Design an enzyme around this catalytic site. Structure first.
Site, short mmCIF file in Angstrom:
data_model
loop_
_atom_site.label_atom_id
_atom_site.label_comp_id
_atom_site.label_asym_id
_atom_site.label_seq_id
_atom_site.Cartn_x
_atom_site.Cartn_y
_atom_site.Cartn_z
N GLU A 103 0.86 -1.16 0.05
CA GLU A 103 0.13 0.09 0.00
C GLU A 103 0.91 1.37 0.02
O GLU A 103 0.59 2.06 -0.77
CB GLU A 103 -0.97 0.02 1.37
CG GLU A 103 -2.06 -1.03 1.24
CD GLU A 103 -3.25 -0.51 0.17
OE1 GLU A 103 -3.31 0.49 -0.73
OE2 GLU A 103 -3.83 -1.49 0.05
N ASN A 107 -7.65 10.01 -5.67
CA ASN A 107 -8.69 9.18 -6.28
C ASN A 107 -9.61 9.81 -7.36
O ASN A 107 -9.97 11.03 -6.95
CB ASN A 107 -9.31 8.16 -5.40
CG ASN A 107 -8.45 7.48 -4.64
OD1 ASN A 107 -8.18 7.49 -3.23
ND2 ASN A 107 -7.67 6.42 -5.13
N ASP A 122 -12.98 9.81 -7.49
CA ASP A 122 -13.92 10.27 -6.76
C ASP A 122 -13.63 11.50 -5.73
O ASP A 122 -14.34 11.73 -4.87
CB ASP A 122 -14.56 9.17 -5.99
CG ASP A 122 -13.78 8.69 -4.67
OD1 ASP A 122 -12.72 9.23 -4.53
OD2 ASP A 122 -14.40 7.84 -3.93
N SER A 141 -11.44 11.61 -3.53
CA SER A 141 -11.17 11.09 -2.05
C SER A 141 -9.58 11.02 -2.15
O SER A 141 -8.97 11.15 -3.22
CB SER A 141 -11.46 9.93 -1.59
OG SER A 141 -11.50 8.69 -2.12
N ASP A 198 -6.27 8.60 -0.31
CA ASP A 198 -5.76 7.70 0.80
C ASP A 198 -4.24 8.22 1.26
O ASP A 198 -3.54 8.82 0.76
CB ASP A 198 -5.12 6.62 -0.23
CG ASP A 198 -6.48 5.75 -0.97
OD1 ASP A 198 -7.51 5.86 -0.38
OD2 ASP A 198 -6.11 5.29 -2.00
N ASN A 207 -8.73 5.75 3.64
CA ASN A 207 -9.46 6.67 2.47
C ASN A 207 -10.30 7.73 2.97
O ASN A 207 -11.07 7.39 4.07
CB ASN A 207 -10.25 5.86 1.51
CG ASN A 207 -10.65 6.49 0.35
OD1 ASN A 207 -11.99 6.91 0.46
ND2 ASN A 207 -10.31 6.80 -0.65
N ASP A 225 -15.55 -3.45 10.20
CA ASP A 225 -16.73 -3.09 9.44
C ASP A 225 -17.66 -4.10 8.65
O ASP A 225 -18.72 -4.32 8.95
CB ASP A 225 -16.59 -1.84 8.66
CG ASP A 225 -17.69 -1.45 7.67
OD1 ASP A 225 -18.44 -0.56 8.15
OD2 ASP A 225 -17.56 -1.55 6.53
#
Length: 129
Positions: free
Chosen positions: A35, A46, A48, A50, A52, A59, A101
């Site tokens: 990562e 990203n 959209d 956002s 990271d 995110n 989650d």
């Protein structure tokens, strides 16, 4: 900062990530390698809107607030700039929430693609733990 493999393994072990929700330590180290290449300052933008952040590339659409991501949820209730610290505690505490989650470590696409299915115990071999 850039962590060494065993240096990170030991920090993550101290923070209770070994076998947390069923995932041994090697999974977490492999996820950080692919990562962020073990760098606490890595950031990735990203499509959209956002970004990271940090050693585990958390995110901003769902987990931390960076003040610039459109439908931001801040489910870790932390500003994203805290995840860029040299100390990994905020990243690890938010990672604990993410894996609790729904889909476990599948949140990390480099884990999903490059760690899952391999012997991840190889990532902590030779480390003083």
């Amino acid at each position: 900062k850039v962590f060494g493999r065993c240096e990170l393994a030991a920090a993550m072990k101290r923070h209770g990530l070994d076998n947390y929700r069923g995932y041994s330590l090697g999974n977490w180290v492999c996820a950080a390698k692919f990562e962020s290449n073990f760098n606490t300052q890595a950031t990735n933008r990203n499509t959209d809107g956002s970004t990271d952040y940090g050693i585990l590339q958390i995110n901003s659409r769902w987990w931390c607030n960076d003040g610039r991501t459109p439908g931001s949820r801040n489910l870790c209730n932390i500003p994203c700039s805290a995840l860029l610290s040299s100390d990994i505690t905020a990243s690890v505490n938010c990672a604990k929430k993410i894996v609790s989650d729904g889909n476990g470590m599948n949140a990390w696409v480099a884990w999903r693609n490059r760690c899952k299915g391999t012997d991840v115990q190889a990532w902590i071999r030779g480390c003083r733990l």
